[PDB]
Symmetry: C2
Subunit: 186 residues, 2 copies
């Protein structure tokens, strides 16, 4: 099982390149969902680990599709697995953006944007970008209704839909409470 | 009402100075609510709540006021010397406190817990480049080290009651993180 070795190298590489905590969470989740959805677990974990490397959001860090490709083949990963990972990540991040493995990776990514973890990230992002808690259309509170509260209805697989239900319900109890703590938050 | 007009004056001033205001507005509403239940002087409570942050070291240097600047503006705005002195004694102590000072302190701490405290913790982490969890500067660490202890330091019966709901909700939020992120407590 050389795939253990290869998976471990990608983790170190990615951790090096770079948040890592998001990537790690998404990979753990992708592996879990992929197992229940009969996807290729190597592909799903690997795609999860590198799903952010080619994004335009990242500054000096952003890698090219071929840089990522070359690194995987350099680690000894096969052409077909490297090709399939690239098809996943390149299908996932272009401006204004499936197979079993692609759907699982996307689901994992989206699950990480809801629930208690999703709420944390929403407020973290707002803090980083100088945005308000509420009071603006760019605020974190607004983004729950613009985006986060709809994600459950866009999940690809039965397994991700299952996991979503609990995370979605909790975000709702969170919003209800926030609205109670701050009357006129809207 | 002369005090209604003075509070509205102070409100517009503070909002103009800080131009954070949302925190101050929430703290003033909470403080007046507690103050009324506790039979504290409501004008002093509201005024202190409104100016409680203006001298705080955490404000940037382009905005932060000296104590004399706060004092002078209050007096110009028509607050009497004695009331103005009371307000100054509260905010310099915050940055035993008086009865009104304890009410303001409680309101300020209430805003740091519950659903609103959760949001604020994560916003701060994002502002300072700190992680969600995984080290001692992380938001998660900050819950254990500081925010989960605030309920023990509430001054008033009214605040203590309000803090129980908020604290318990924050405990539910932690439980949810622990569930969704296996190993979160040990993660680095
Ligand atoms: Ni992602
Ligand atoms: Ni404050």
């Amino acid at each position: 099982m050389t795939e253990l070795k290869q998976a471990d190298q990608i983790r170190t590489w990615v951790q090096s390149v770079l948040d890592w905590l998001h990537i790690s969470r998404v990979a753990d989740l992708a592996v879990y969902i992929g197992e229940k959805e009969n996807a290729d677990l190597f592909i799903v974990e690997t795609a999860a680990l590198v799903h952010d490397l080619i994004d335009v959001k990242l500054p000096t860090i952003r890698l090219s599709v071929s840089e990522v490709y070359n690194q995987l083949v350099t680690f000894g990963i096969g052409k077909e697995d490297a090709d399939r990972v690239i098809h996943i990540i390149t299908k996932m991040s272009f401006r204004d953006r499936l197979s079993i493995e692609g759907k699982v990776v996307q689901d994992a990514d989206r699950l990480d944007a809801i629930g208690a973890v999703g709420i944390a990230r929403a407020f973290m992002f707002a803090g980083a970008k100088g945005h308000g808690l509420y009071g603006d259309d760019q605020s974190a509170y607004a983004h729950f209704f613009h985006k986060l509260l709809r994600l459950i209805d866009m999940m690809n697989t039965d397994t991700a839909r299952e996991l979503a239900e609990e995370r979605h319900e909790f975000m709702l109890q969170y919003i209800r409470q926030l609205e109670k703590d701050i009357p006129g938050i809207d």
